[PDB]
Design a protein around this nucleic acid. Sequence first.
DNA 1: TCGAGAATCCCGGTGCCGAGGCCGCTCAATTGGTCGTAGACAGCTCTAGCACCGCTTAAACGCACGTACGCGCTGTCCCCCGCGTTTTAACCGCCAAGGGGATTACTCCCTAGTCTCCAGGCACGTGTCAGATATATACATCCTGA
DNA 2: TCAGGATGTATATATCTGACACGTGCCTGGAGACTAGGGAGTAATCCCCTTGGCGGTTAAAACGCGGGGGACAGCGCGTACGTGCGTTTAAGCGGTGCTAGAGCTGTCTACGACCAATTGAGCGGCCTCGGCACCGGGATTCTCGA
Lengths: 107, 107, 581, 93, 93, 98, 95, 87, 86
Amino acid sequence: AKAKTRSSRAGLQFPVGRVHRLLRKGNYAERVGAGAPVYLAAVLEYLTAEILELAGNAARDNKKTRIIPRHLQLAVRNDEELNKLLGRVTIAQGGVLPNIQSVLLPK
Amino acid sequence: AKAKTRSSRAGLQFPVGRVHRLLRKGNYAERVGAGAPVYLAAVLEYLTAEILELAGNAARDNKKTRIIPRHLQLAVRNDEELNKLLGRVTIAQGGVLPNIQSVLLPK
Amino acid sequence: LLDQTKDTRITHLLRQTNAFLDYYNVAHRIKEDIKKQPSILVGGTLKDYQIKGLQWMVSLFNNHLNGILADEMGLGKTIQTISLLTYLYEMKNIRGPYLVIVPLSTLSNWSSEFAKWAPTLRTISFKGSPNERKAKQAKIRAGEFDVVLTTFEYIIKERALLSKVKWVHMIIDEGHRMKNAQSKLSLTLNTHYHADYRLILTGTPLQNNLPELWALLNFVLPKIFNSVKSFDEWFNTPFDKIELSEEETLLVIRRLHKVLRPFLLRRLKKDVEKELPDKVEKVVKCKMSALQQIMYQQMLKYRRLGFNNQIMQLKKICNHPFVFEEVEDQINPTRETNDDIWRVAGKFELLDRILPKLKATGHRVLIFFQMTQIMDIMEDFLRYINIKYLRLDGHTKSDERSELLRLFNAPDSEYLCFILSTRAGGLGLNLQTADTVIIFDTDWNPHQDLQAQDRAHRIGQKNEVRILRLITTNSVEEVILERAYKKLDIDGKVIQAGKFDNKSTSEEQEALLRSLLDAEEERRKKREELKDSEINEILARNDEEMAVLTRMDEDRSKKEEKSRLLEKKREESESAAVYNG
Amino acid sequence: TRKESYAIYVYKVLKQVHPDTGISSKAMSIMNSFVNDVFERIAGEASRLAHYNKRSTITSREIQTAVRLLLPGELAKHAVSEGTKAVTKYTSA
Amino acid sequence: TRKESYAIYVYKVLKQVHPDTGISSKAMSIMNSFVNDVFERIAGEASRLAHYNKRSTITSREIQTAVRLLLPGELAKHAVSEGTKAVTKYTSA
Amino acid sequence: KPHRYRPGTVALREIRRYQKSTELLIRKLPFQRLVREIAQDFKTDLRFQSSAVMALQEASEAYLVALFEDTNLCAIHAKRVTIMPKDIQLARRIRGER
Amino acid sequence: RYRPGTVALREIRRYQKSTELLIRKLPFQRLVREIAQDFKTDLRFQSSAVMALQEASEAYLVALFEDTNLCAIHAKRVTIMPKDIQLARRIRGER
Amino acid sequence: AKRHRKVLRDNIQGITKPAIRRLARRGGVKRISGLIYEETRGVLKVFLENVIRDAVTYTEHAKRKTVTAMDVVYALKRQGRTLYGFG
Amino acid sequence: RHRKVLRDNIQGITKPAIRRLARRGGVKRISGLIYEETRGVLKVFLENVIRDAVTYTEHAKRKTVTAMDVVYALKRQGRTLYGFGG
DNA sequence: TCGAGAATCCCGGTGCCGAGGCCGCTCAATTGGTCGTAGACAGCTCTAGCACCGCTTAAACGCACGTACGCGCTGTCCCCCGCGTTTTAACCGCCAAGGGGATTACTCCCTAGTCTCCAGGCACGTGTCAGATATATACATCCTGA
DNA sequence: TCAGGATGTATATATCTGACACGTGCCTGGAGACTAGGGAGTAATCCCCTTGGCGGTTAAAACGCGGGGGACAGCGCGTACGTGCGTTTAAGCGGTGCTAGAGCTGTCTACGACCAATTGAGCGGCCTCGGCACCGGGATTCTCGA
């Protein structure tokens, strides 16, 4: 009867049990499923590694080992669909990337 | 042991029991209160009689006994805060009240 | 024996029409019989069947009740209809009011016959723009009218007039367009208020599903309204093989013919005018082709075996191989007409033999289409063979319909195959020239016999009528044939009905009625590719046509004609439908 | 076959406000879904509003702050007057 | 005193994606509330999504249509590939 | 000399006649085959009630009316009455769509 | 010297390039405390909440000058007036 | 030949010049340029494409092939377009 | 512990500061009447966010306003702030 | 400066189809008597906000100063408003199958509920290193003048 | 086009400051074990939803031509914030207390679940009839020119 976390059975990081019990007590539904928190863990893996990966590419572009919320905003708004989902929501300390209008600059 | 609806104890129209059980089975909270569905019934009384009253004033202005969704849109948008709450949401068959821009009309 | 109790049930409800303004004796209790036509009748004479039909409508006039004229098109229904209008205008001196309802396509005939037969009757016609309609709309409200024309589509728009006014005798036409129960035109008649009397008039008997229960078997007659609404379930199961449908149900159906004696009247032209010597009804059986081979049945495997399987994956692609044209770029990516694109279909292959021979033998062919997408594709490849022809459709807008016929009826005209649909023309097209008819797919309702054949069998064609009905082996349109043709031939008792629903010589409803009851044994016999040379013999009318086809044979039989067909080119099988689904 | 709506409730409101005024079916439906949606905002926001403090049961104060925070303006004061008036009238018996 | 956060989870994600890249506390917090809010949208919309059909229990299909309907674009296809891949990997054992 | 009107007055009478009436404006069946045609691209054989066609038709109808109204305010603010692609793309740009 | 407007370009690039905070903390501090004194007495404010609201209204207000800038360039006049910004808050659905 | 269904007036132009004309007359704008037609039909096709995408998502989730009115009510309600009178 | 009353409780935002804040927005030309209206709309939005915040803190029966109440006020306000919790 | 044509509401009646009732049914609202339990005060920490408070300094403000720029005016044409005319496909109605949403009903079944038992993440000290300010320098980029 | 100045930059360095990781207590998530009720795959079942078409009727939809007037550059000029230059000066900043209440835990109940029993309240089918839509036709009201 060895205890083995079911989150490691799928080879993931975010735990299935914490999101499972949190979804239970979160009064979202009167019951819960089995593979639903596993699928949640999966999409959290791919999204977290997605935006974290673009953040790593931005920090590598700026020659910085660590990451900055500036690089987070640049990574978000650079991507098309990622900024399409986050276009309505704002950010904290991220800012606005440099942009110059067409006729605003002189000849 | 005479049965007397508790909605009539407050002298209201919308029932306390239907909104109470509906709020229970509506999985909004793990438990429910006592006077909460009564307060819900009250605000439904004042809001329903509010917008229904402005609708009655609009139908009386147009010399129509019954009410029309046109008169509903006119009643909503005429009021300041009532249109402020409903400004984001649209309507069905209501339409747009006549409006003329300043310089759009000739001299 | 439920119809025997109906003899006593009529006496209560029979006086609704008379007082409030044995089924023989109750109908025969009053004596008025006049055989002679009216003296004011001008413009021709009445045939023996028109004289009796007149008095037969006078036999209806005995107790004044409603009646039905079910007879065949081409017998001059207009003559028999205008006869009663001028007959009652004279004898009984009631002089009106009279109301007639005719379709707009045939209204030109009804409006033109008011000159010859009845000059003295002032009429009214509503057609064209509402302003021209308003001209006679205000004139009739003053009380000026005798017989008023109108069509079906304006009945809902004539509600103004008919609601406030009141009529006596109304007459209609096209009684088998009334066949829709819930139809507004059926509901407007109840909204129409009422009148004294009426004559429901149809050109063809009951069609499609179980025999007509809504109007002739309910709405027309005083006892018949609510009576059979309870009996509707009992007589519907009549229509366990020999015991039901033959042994006992015989007299059960005979009681259905027993109650309809005074009501319906139907007489064929072959029993009165008999100008047509006879018809010829053959068939043909083809097989599949490249796209129509098991790939066809395989196309049923993709979708089910969009939606509407009968329409989409069956009726469409059984005639022409590729439909909706998305798969056209697969077999033929150039979408350009070239040699033998139209011969890859099984149903279409047979026509490659007949079209060359009909030109040398000088025969003119009538064609009726379904699935109007086939109409253009047919004509398109018909440019490749380079033979003359003429088109038509429901989009003609009624203008060229009458004009194109004078170009078709020209004797010097080499136009042969004549394009038509089944529902187009309203049977008023009046084509006596073409002696040959071919049909690609079966029609569900008998109108295929009651429309397409009325183009041939009508007066003016003295030659033999030929019909070619296409079918393929192991296909879906097979079972429709038995369903359309065979299973709906219960109306064969109805086409037999009018024979003994007429003057009805005694031997007709027993001795010669059994002859029709001997036709069901061949149904089991038919229930149990052919050859291009086998059809070669049956398409020739006489001996000198047999001699010229052998000369045409030796010409095309020396040279090969590729092959007669084309087979599935093996790559299009799995490549076609895997990218669509 | 089985459906539920306020209906005669709102109709009696019309009878006690404007007796001579009528209402159509489309108006009863648009006001039906109107009050149902307003209730969806009140209870929907009151859910997480009670979830902030980790309070299991919902009470009249949760709905109070709920609808008071929902619609801005002076209308909330009338909501407090009529609402709390009905609360005291209900608890008084 | 008692607080919960993903933390070392996201940190190990960083270790398995970009080992040489570091993360600050503000970044761990903004991505913490980021994934918590994205989960709030997925489960929050999945609640009423399962409420439309009157289905009491929530399943993997409810979350499937939930997040698939949440974010538009081609990203949903990768969400289906990785997500259903982890579902089949979990149910396979 | 025939009868005419000064340019723009007929437009006033129209705008009053439409804004005064609540009747449906755009035509049903073109919207029907529009929704069916664009819906055929996603999934096969969708069944549409007329109530849903009135739903989406009136929704996008009135919202699009609000789009021409917002575009009209941007145009009158632009000092040029004529609406161009620029003020309407600025309307859908400020609305937060693209 | 410099041609008029070029210094503005160099500025805009320097700011839009940097993510650092712009408006000053303490004026916003006594602003929130002063406007908050009108509603309720003795409110306690953490610096994290001051950064919260300050960065929120800061970036959103930047979006207001950006939207107003697009309305200005569409107006054919580069200069922003009360009209295009009140039209910005009007189209945003505030008043 | 002319049998090909490719040649026809495209379905995106089902909305016509006097149609959208009257529509903008209800909108309140007067003078309209040429590209307002095509561009407005573009936004129409894009937005209605998103809405029908949501609708086929909800209805596809129910395993039913019938997109109902309550569906459109749920999509518009989630977007903020909520349409009363039906749901 | 003590009290300090000093003037300029409204316009205290300085034109160089808010001017640079507009420079972050990419605006080219800034008029003289933009500042007052900007503090007007910022004042109304301030009324909204602080009315919400005091609704939260007033509901919590606490005398201290927390950043969580601001995250929720902005939350139902339509913008979700991240990194400070919630 | 006003007197000539169309456009539109005001009555003046008429069909007409849902709105209000009205009645039968039936089932969720209501009541009574358990029964387990958050939650409503009560007390105790202790802590980060709340003021001075002296010191420092980039930031804000008043002032000069000065070219861009927007406001107003002015001519040119070309595009949409508005007339007329064709023309024309949605809107009804009507054919004739075939098939897809909802109600009982039932009986297997999969994840709450709970109970026992164990190992994993998280608050807490820790000491070591990635990064931000301070500084000098050939190189990168806009201005004013020729 | 290049002399003479305002803004960036990478090569030592050294120097505060936070991130990382290396071990410890401690709430806790899972893994067997056993009941219970939500749901699904069956199967009738009646009313709308779809395919192929016809027959018509219009009020819109499209095209052609006149022509009125505003988009649309081009020009002149009166300001007015943009750009320095001093001159205050209040924002920080670290360094002192102080404390009102956030938070955490302990304890005794008033209070909502929860089941059994009881019905009027509200929901499906009739019914009938007065307010609303519609067609005239005429009294203006509105618009545009002599």
